[PDB]
Structure 1
Amino acid sequence: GSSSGLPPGWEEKQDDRGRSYYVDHNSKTTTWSKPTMQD
């Protein structure tokens, strides 16, 4: 399904300043990576 959130296995959270890092459910890690589905 199309979905209305972050890419499958990914979720985006910003820091206290305002820069958004990604928490990857795929490998389970909070880091700066581009989604599995890069779009």
Structure 2
Amino acid sequence: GSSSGLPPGWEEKQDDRGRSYYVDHNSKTTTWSKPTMQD
């Protein structure tokens, strides 16, 4: 807990092609998705 932005266990970083992707450490899988906002 420290503000909010990335889900628990998500790394935001660029791939070989140089695009910012996200990887979920929960299942351990790279998934290029844009995190939704629930407010």
Give the TM-score of the pair, scaled to structure 2.
0.51
Identity %: 100
- Using a 3 Å threshold, how does the CA distance of structure 1 residues 9 and 30 change in structure 2: closer, same or farther? same
- 1:37 deviates by 7.3
1:1-38 C-alpha deviation (Å, 9 max, x unpaired) = 31698442100120234311111112210121344876
Structure 2: gaps spanning 5 or more residues = none
| Cα root mean square deviation, aligned | 3.2
- Using a 3 Å threshold, how does the CA distance of structure 1 residues 33 and 27 change in structure 2: closer, same or farther? farther
Structure 1 CA distance for aligned equivalents of residues 4 and 23 of structure 2: 17
Q: Which runs of 4+ in 1 moved over 3 A?
A: 3-7, 34-39
- Using a 3 Å threshold, how does the CA distance of structure 1 residues 22 and 6 change in structure 2: closer, same or farther? same
Structure possessing the higher relative contact order (Cα contacts under 8 Å, 6 or more residues apart): 1
Structure 1: gaps spanning 5 or more residues = none
